[PDB]
């Protein structure tokens, strides 16, 4: 696979790292050790601004990793827990469909490319708006945070 559990000392899942475009990327707030022998002890570079940390993907894994795409037209997208809507510049899910432990999971299109990484969500009632990292065409990271975001 290309998505890895990040585990605390008791071995409980805290969040997820992904393999993407020659990097291991996980949310910075996710406390733990990636649960992969090749990934556990790499040198990570940490960016507070984007709540992101990343390491170089070990050479073994370069044909494995997800592709990223900047093409997110309005519509529906996929994640581990089901449909993610993208509309008016925001990703949303039914409230209750995501929660703590979900930080780091990718949002995917039907071809299996990453459009966004999940940081948290703000409860707006029926729907929860997702705080995420995306990248633009020049490779610049963008963090979108909504009011009263709960880190997952």
Numbering used by the authors: 116 to 267
Q: Which statements did the authors publish about this structure?
A:
The nucleocapsid core is formed by the encapsidation of RNA by CP which consists of two domains: the amino-terminal domain that is involved in RNA binding and the carboxyl-terminal domain that possesses protease activity. The E2 glycoprotein interacts with the nucleocapsid complex via a hydrophobic pocket present in the carboxyl-terminal region of the CP that leads to budding of alphaviruses. Alphavirus CP possesses cis-autoproteolytic activity for its cleavage from the rest of the structural polyprotein during the viral infection process. Here, we report the high-resolution crystal structures of the post-cleavage state of the AVCP and dioxane-bound AVCP at 1.81 Å and 1.98 Å resolution respectively.
Similarly, the structure of AVCP complexed with dioxane was refined to 1.98 Å resolution with Rcryst value of 17.9% and Rfree value of 26.7%. The superposition of AVCP-apo and AVCP-dioxane structures showed RMSD of 0.133 Å and dioxane binding does not affect the overall structure of AVCP. The electron density for the dioxane molecule is clearly visible in the difference Fourier map in the hydrophobic pocket of AVCP. Dioxane binds to the hydrophobic pocket in the AVCP-dioxane complex in almost the same orientation as that of the SCP-dioxane structure with similar hydrophobic interactions. However, in AVCP, seven residues (Met135, Glu136, Lys138, Ile140, Tyr183, Trp250 and Gly254) are in hydrophobic contact with the bound dioxane molecule. Eight residues out of nine in this hydrophobic pocket are strictly conserved whereas Met137 of SCP is substituted with Ile140 in AVCP. Further interaction analysis of cdE2 and capsid reveals that dioxane occupies the same position as would be occupied by the pyrrolidine ring of Pro405 of cdE2. Thus, competitive inhibition could be a plausible mechanism by which dioxane and its derivatives may disrupt capsid-E2 interaction in alphaviruses including Aura virus by obstructing the hydrophobic interaction of conserved Pro405 with CP. The crystal structure of the AVCP-dioxane complex has also been determined and the most striking feature observed in it is that dioxane exclusively occupies the position of Pro405 in the CP hydrophobic pocket. The conservation of alphavirus capsid hydrophobic pocket and binding of dioxane to the same hydrophobic pocket in the crystal structure of CP from two alphaviruses (SCP and AVCP) signifies that a broad-spectrum inhibitor that targets CP-E2 interactions during virus budding can be developed.
